[model samples]
Target chain A: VPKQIDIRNLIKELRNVEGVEEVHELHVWQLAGSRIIATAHIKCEDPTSYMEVAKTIKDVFHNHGIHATTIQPEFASVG
Target chain B: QIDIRNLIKELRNVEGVEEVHELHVWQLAGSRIIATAHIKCEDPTSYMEVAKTIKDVFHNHGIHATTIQPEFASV
Candidate 1:
């Protein structure tokens, strides 16, 4: 059975991912049973780097026992 | 061009939508636009209900090819 995953921890790890400029609008919900669904918008330097950031996002969620994760990438303006 | 800020405000106004997590907009033409968003809401509300409201709002705003993902609140 799945157990509730810690949302704050996931948010922290997401912010630390390489090439992730920022993480905005993060949410998590516990589904029926122990399963959980996580979603967030990740800001990256460019669209080309999104896939790399996405992989890290998935790994972070999976390690924390969240199997269903949705990561959407958006470009952050650079100085 | 699409007014991204205005579109986001409308999305936030939805009754069950607690937060607007992310929004992306593209200007396909002078009159055509596309958008995608991630939204948060209460866990008790079904996805179907959320999706329908989202679609209705977008349609009224003249945004096409809109995609919405509903995330139930952890709190």
Candidate 2:
């Protein structure tokens, strides 16, 4: 079996979050060769929705072994 | 790599940068370091413009690789 992490579904889940415009700068790595950690910049159009988006991101990352989920709630013009 | 606080000071000094955070300064190849951060600007359309300026600030500090995510307060 290949020892690689597949995040295809994870990306999809993040894209589905309401108020999320884009997700970038995503990086995942294993600490102590076991526990997984992640980081990403989540873009949105409304700063008012950041709390909601951040909550969703925390929930999503928890499903993927990222408990210390820290998301950057960014507001940007959608392309 | 340069000091994270100092680098951010320079970034904040750049025109249009209203806020910046979640900055991680790590990784280096040869002489340049790699960095990433999130920034909020006054004008959303200036994200691209401001992004380049952020990179320039990093480049000056010996950080050649950077990933800067932009944010706008208003839609």
Candidate 3:
């Protein structure tokens, strides 16, 4: 079964992250020993400095036992 | 792995698709590309328009499975 803790806590934290426009395509897989693997595509207002946001996201996942996470920054607006 | 560069380029060319970001494509089977992406646009109402365009483009390319999240700038 999927990790409920990550679905609740981690997703909540991601939604609260600064500059996050939206979060979707979030999927978390349960692994052995209470670990989790997640994949998500996040929309951010800025892509220039995404490393900071990525770190924050990873931290949230870590708090909920997610050891592997893949975050993709949605594209920037032209205008 | 599917070579997604062409798909990305085509998306960028879509009318009203202001910016294409965070586009991920996977090959579910031979010649079948499944994609998920976030596109940035200034106008929130334009989301549907761009979404339609995205669907059309992918369908034309034989990519039947796709998910697109339209993002607008926060004021």
Candidate 4:
């Protein structure tokens, strides 16, 4: 049976990456599981700067033999 | 998705302008409103009286309003 990965520590390390200006933590309702959902909001110099950041995080997780459920970019009202 | 809420708050403190308002996003409910305002225009030649007031307002909020359309000033 697949289980939730202990990613809290790993996420903290990711925040130290260069060009990552912000991070966020998010949660959602899960009727049968722990409600804590880890999230990061990386503010970059430009939107495209997220590519290298995302790759580095994935590589680190893979090296630890933990697969993340989801890793994606977020949007904001830029005006 | 530009919520001009805080931006307008910054505008309220300008000296010459008595008020600032945001029009509905339509002239008659069919077109997008590009953000505009009416000024006292106390100095028509340079409009500096209005400019000082507006610039101060805009500067505080970091907005240029370079592309906004103008509406008639009733006063």
TM-score of 4: 0.34
Clashes, model 2 = 1
Q: Give the DockQ of candidate 1.
A: 0.02
> Which window of ten consecutive residues has the lowest lDDT sum in model 2 chain B?
B26-35
- Summarize candidate 4's per-residue lDDT along B13-73 as a digit string, tens digits: 5554555555222223242222355443223443445555554444344432222222334
> What's the residue-level lDDT of A28 in candidate 3?
87
Residues B1-75, candidate 1: write the lDDT tens digits: 556677678788878888997687766545335578888888754666667677667756665346677788764
Clashing pairs in 3: A75-B21
> Comparing to the true complex, what docking class would candidate 4 get?
incorrect
- For B2-65, candidate 2 gives per-residue lDDT tens digits of 5878888999998889988999987543433457899987667766677767877876776544
Clashing pairs in 4: A24-A41
Better of 1 and 4 by DockQ: 4
All candidates: CA RMSD (Å): 14.8, 13.8, 12.6, 15.4
Query: Model 2 off-target regions past 4 Å?
Result: A1-4, A77-79, B1-75
Per-residue CA lDDT of candidate 4, range A5-25, in tens?
A: 454566566666644555565
Query: What are the per-residue Cα lDDT tens digits for candidate 1 across A1-79?
Result: 4344456667778888766778988878787756688888898644545654577789888887878877777863221
| Positional deviation of residue B55's Cα in model 4 after best superposition, in angstroms | 22
Q: Give me the TM-scores of chain B across the candidates.
A: 0.76, 0.82, 0.78, 0.43
DockQ of each: 0.02, 0.02, 0.03, 0.03
- The Cα error of candidate 1 at residue B32, in Å, is 37
